Amino acid sequence: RPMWYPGATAPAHLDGSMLGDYGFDPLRLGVNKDNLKWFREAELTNGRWAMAAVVGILFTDAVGLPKFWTAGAEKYALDNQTLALIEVAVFAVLEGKRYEIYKKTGETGFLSFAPFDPMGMKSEEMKLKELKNGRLAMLAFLGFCSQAAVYGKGPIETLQLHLADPGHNNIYTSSVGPETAVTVAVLCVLPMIIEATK
């Protein structure tokens, strides 16, 4: 059972019953058993949202459509006032039906279908793959927003620019260079800090 660094120790409440366990809880926010399930469901839905959002942002830059941070300013074939009213009206019923699913079963669902799987490949390994991909997509979305904050342009453009000069084009040579360098050094020292005390 690999941990979040070579030589970690579970904080007595992450024994491994949950999928994708690595003993990562320094703030100990999952000390409560009741909060662990809710936080897990929140992590799963945040991961699903980030997965769909990252795939959508990556697809818009390939075709040539407007950037993800400027797509809202574009004029569509509707009114923004009516869009917000419809969005909160549909999501009220959708989120209400999803919340009642978690109280009866404990996982996500769509509308009145708690185990929503028309094809049927709901396996234990598939649940962990969803969590891993969701975590990766959450970091990817944070990276998309951060790259657009300092460099702008776009994710695909950022990757293309990094290939031109990898030794000179990175987060360390950008406007947030020293902060991230100090943070990387502090993070690299952190496992030794935890292992020195234990």
Binding site: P6, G7, G167, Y172, T173, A181, A185, P191, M192
Partner: protein, 183 residues
Amino acid sequence: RPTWLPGLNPPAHLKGALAGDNGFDPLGLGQDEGRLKWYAEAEKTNGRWAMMAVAGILGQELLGVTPAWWEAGAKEYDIPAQALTPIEFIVMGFLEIKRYQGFKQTGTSGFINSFPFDPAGMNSPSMATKEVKNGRLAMVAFIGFCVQALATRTQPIEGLTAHLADPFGKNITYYLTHLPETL
């Protein structure tokens, strides 16, 4: 067992079981065996880094590099110093955490997961004493290199040749007194 001060008995916390134990501890930093063994490992690795540093400085001077050993940091290189720091910190953190965890399982040095990292044998207590003594000499030599470059602005081999050419002169007295002429 000869000690550092003649007629001085070695302390009780210092026994000849260690490699370079000469009974030298006027401050008493090795009272407990736990801190003593941790400091022994710290001395060995400090000496290893100093040995590599002195060897590198002497090799750079012998091979005729353009900047001196105190200017190599500011020299232009591919993948600038701003980008070299995180890569070095990440790889050093991994290597050092593996070295530290291997030290907890067994009280010896290593390399990632080879504890002890001893290929081709050739290990003996005498070799351990030689390693500790060479490390101490290298540490003193590195500090000598730093202070020599500070007060004389000359590289190690250059300063040694300057001292050999004129022994009664070009020493600490001349360099400490003729400081404006050096700059």
